[PDB]
């Protein structure tokens, strides 16, 4: 047994000393994109990969082969979409060029990136039994998009998978498919956007144009977000994806403590930096089952901790402004006290 | 024909 512990520590130093020869490769499957609510495809924190310790100078064909065996899929029934970190702070699936990129090593394909994250497109093994296969993809003339539905009622995003389609296609021709995937009746009146990056969510105006023209900088892994064109949306809190990604971009968590209760640990509230007095007051009053009119809030002292000046209710400002004196680390807190009836 | 971009530039 003591020998076996000398073989265990020893072999693990080789792997430590050989790790510079190896790279990790993180595979992510479309199931992982389901029910994600944030920008792009998935949350890097909540995502679950299928990892692979792989030789830096090994060939692609080798990985492809290996993969097909580990996961359990034919080699012609899977396609790889390497994840790309773009200039604009998004991470999307990008293409990879089998033909021109056929006789290159792994590490170089990652562009010296490690770990290297890769989207695995496989045919649903359920639909695969029923005669289906992974379609052909004219790199030059087809594009791969991703579809997201937004429900203003629930204020949520519902992944609707990806589609291959030809670049030349009109947007009007992809409406059915969107309706279907979202489970709407055909000829349902929709509203479409491009998720471009966080905070930026441009509306698509002319449907009767080619995809080329319709998304500024068309590329694979572009994301169309769509919803119902319905009056009921006005009722909601966030009728557009555009608004959603704002609330999300400006989402920030704030702790609230009773000034009158010494050392009160208080309660967090998730709020938006572009709120005004009213929106912050009304939020917290819902969390205290109280009239907002009975809440007095207090500004930040900047340097010292503890409640500062008493915040008047005609405060023309935004929460960004209230929080502006908290270092990145510093937890974001605001003091309040209740008033009398 | 109609192509996609190589690179996003915003
Ligand atoms: Cl909400
Ligand atoms: Cl509480």
Residue numbers in the entry:
A (entry chain A): 543 to 883
B (entry chain D): 617 to 626
Which of the paper's sentences describe this entry?
Ubiquitin specific protease 7 (USP7) catalyzes the deubiquitination of many cellular proteins involved in tumor suppression, neural stem cell maintenance, DNA damage and immune responses. In fact USP7 was first discovered through its strong and specific interaction with the ICP0 protein of HSV-1, leading to its original name of Herpesvirus Associated USP (HAUSP). This study shows the structural basis of interaction between the first three C-terminal ubiquitin-like domains complexed with an ICP0 peptide, revealing a protein binding pocket at Ubl2 of USP7-CTD.
The ICP0 peptide binds to a predominantly negatively charged area between 758DELMDGD764 on Ubl2. These two lysine residues belong to the central part of the peptide (KCARKT), which is in close contact with USP7 due to a backbone-to-backbone hydrogen bond (ICP0 nitrogen-C621 with USP7 oxygen-L760). The central part of the peptide shows identical binding to both USP7 chains in the asymmetric unit and has a strong and clearly interpretable electron density. The crystal structure of all five C-terminal Ubl domains shows an extended conformation of Ubl123, matching the conformation of our Se-Ubl123 structure. A superposition of all available USP7 fragments containing Ubl123 shows two distinct orientations of Ubl3 compared to Ubl12 with a 35 degree motion and a pivot at residue H792. Closer inspection of the residues within the hinge reveals that the change in orientation is originating in the connection between Ubl2 and Ubl3, involving a change in the hydrogen bond network of residues H792, S814 and N815. Our crystallographic studies reveal a very similar orientation of the spacer helix in four crystallographically independent chains, suggesting that this helix provides a preferred orientation between CAT and Ubl12, significantly minimizing the spectrum of possible full-length conformations of USP7. The overlapping spacer helix together with the CTD now allows the generation of a nearly complete three-dimensional model of USP7, only missing some disordered N- and C-terminal residues. The resulting model of CAT-CTD is somewhat V-shaped, and intriguingly, the hinge between Ubl2 and Ubl3 (described above) affects the angle between the two arms and thereby the distance between Ubl45 and CAT. In the compact conformation of Ubl123, the distance between the catalytic domain and Ubl45 is drastically reduced from 75 Å (extended conformation) to 50 Å.
